[PDB]
């Protein structure tokens, strides 16, 4: 769904507004 955009293609955020990977970017 599209609220805060989000981020590219396979990529997940933290509520900080990380984005990485979807899954573990290195230090999870």
Known sequence: ENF???CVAG???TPDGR???T???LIT
Do not use: I, L, V
């Open 4 to 6: 805060s955009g989000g």
């Open 11 to 13: 990529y997940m955020r």
């Open 19 to 21: 984005c990485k990977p």
């Open 23 to 25: 899954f573990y970017q």
